[PDB]
Design a protein around this ligand. Structure first.
Ligand SMILES: OC[C@H]1O[C@@H](S[C@@H]2O[C@H](CO)[C@H](O)[C@H](O)[C@H]2O)[C@H](O)[C@@H](O)[C@H]1O
Ligand SMILES: OC[C@H]1O[C@@H](S[C@@H]2O[C@H](CO)[C@H](O)[C@H](O)[C@H]2O)[C@H](O)[C@@H](O)[C@H]1O
Ligand SMILES: OC[C@H]1O[C@@H](S[C@@H]2O[C@H](CO)[C@H](O)[C@H](O)[C@H]2O)[C@H](O)[C@@H](O)[C@H]1O
Ligand SMILES: OC[C@H]1O[C@@H](S[C@@H]2O[C@H](CO)[C@H](O)[C@H](O)[C@H]2O)[C@H](O)[C@@H](O)[C@H]1O
Ligand SMILES: OC[C@H]1O[C@@H](S[C@@H]2O[C@H](CO)[C@H](O)[C@H](O)[C@H]2O)[C@H](O)[C@@H](O)[C@H]1O
Lengths: 103, 103, 103, 103, 103
């Protein structure tokens, strides 16, 4: 299995690593129909989302999608620094695939 | 693919954005039959609710409803400031569709 | 929908509002068969339970019961002040229907 | 329903109350097959387990078993004092049936 | 039932105990398809994973896997020191079977 977020991210197409080294600036969570999602921003101006489950997701990802939202909420509340984000860049805002936190 | 809560809020009918910029004053949680909901208030005087799951909610929203209630609780306990709320105004009290937090 | 715990409590038969305005003194949790419940007490000596799910509960209450237990545990751990409790008084200890927390 | 852990505990076969009045010393969590359990110890030398779900547990206990594990982990992480433990003593280590906390 | 992580670890083949006595340095979480896993590292250079659920896992382990990921996240966020780890060493990075922490 991969050992780093960078190694993991490269196993996929349409992904990009973003070096954030910062805490989340804003957290947005929606339960509005068809938009059950979370959007996070950074002081840097970059915006990312955890996508609404859909056709392209494999079953195994459903639980992971819920976990990611859980992680982003607590990471935001605790003002924890995010190291890197592996994101799918064929979505707008970019879609979070993986996250890493250091220290 | 909204980038902000206001943009997200505009995709729905009967919604409005409330700029709160404050922590939740009261948190009320009910497990009474047909009243399984959460109600929050702000010192401003606004009261909002996370509705009881009903026939108007699609299947994707069920988990989102539970997530929102989780978010409101932890947000209240941590005295975290809420920035904006996207709410449905055809309900009394207004029903939360999305929340955003900043700082 | 109700806007306050008092308004909400008044919608049911066999309920009464207890003004606590204090943190929980003790938290008891049981996983013993047929006694899967939580019991909380206050300095005042007042004691309350979240009932074991039974035939009197409607399906929609099942997840609300679990949420209420989650809520009591975290408010206990955080020393959070409980404002009022809406409880059914035809059970001993009185059974928690709704809880409100405020400044 | 019982009003205290002592009363609750007395309702079962093969159980005894342990007055611990101390925070958990060590927390062990296993996800190894047929050993998905939690083990906790105290300075006094007492060791207790939350049993792996088994053929002796009724359905309603399944959710309670998972809750108990959640409770022990957060109690450990928060250095919260455990008041008493009601345990089944026909198991080694003794199996947790209920726990109470005060302070 | 085993009484210590060391005893529990011994019951398995291809396992090994790691004495860490340190907080997690970094936490990486992935929801990328087929890589829904968590990777943690320590200052020492040790890297461990919570494997993606697969054909090697039995019924009861599925919930335990999710629990372990929850634990690692909260342990990381709280900078809680990890004492020992029981890992399967026929995986790269080594796969976590059990974790123990002492306060
Ligand atoms: O990553 C391999 C899988 O790709 C998706 S399509 C892909 O899905 C991710 C979320 O997993 C993002 O939404 C990307 O934006 C989107 O392009 C396929 O449907 C799967 O079959 C795999 O090929
Ligand atoms: O928002 C589009 C959907 O509207 C609901 S009705 C709508 O439901 C929300 C919660 O999703 C709030 O309760 C509002 O008060 C209520 O008006 C429809 O039933 C769906 O078919 C969509 O049209
Ligand atoms: O509250 C209306 C419902 O009353 C219950 S009986 C009631 O149930 C609550 C929990 O909802 C407590 O256990 C009370 O002690 C108990 O009396 C009915 O079963 C429902 O049909 C509603 O009528
Ligand atoms: O407690 C009454 C029930 O006892 C179990 S056997 C009992 O189960 C608990 C967990 O509920 C512990 O594992 C004890 O060590 C074990 O002896 C029966 O199977 C049920 O029939 C009830 O009688
Ligand atoms: O541990 C006994 C079982 O071993 C697995 S194979 C074993 O699985 C663990 C997770 O349970 C790790 O992935 C190890 O790397 C892997 O080798 C068998 O499939 C089961 O039948 C038991 O024999």
């Amino acid at each position: 299995a991969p050992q780093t977020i960078t190694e993991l991210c490269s196993e996929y197409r349409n992904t990009q690593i973003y070096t954030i080294n910062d805490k989340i600036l804003s957290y947005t969570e929606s339960m509005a129909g068809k938009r059950e999602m979370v959007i996070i921003t950074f002081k840097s101006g970059e915006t990312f989302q955890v996508e609404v489950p859909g056709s392209q997701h494999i079953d195994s990802q459903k639980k992971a999608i819920e976990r990611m939202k859980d992680t982003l909420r607590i990471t935001y509340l605790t003002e924890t620094k995010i190291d890197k984000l592996c994101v799918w860049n064929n979505k707008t805002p970019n879609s979070i695939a993986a996250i890493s936190m250091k220290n």
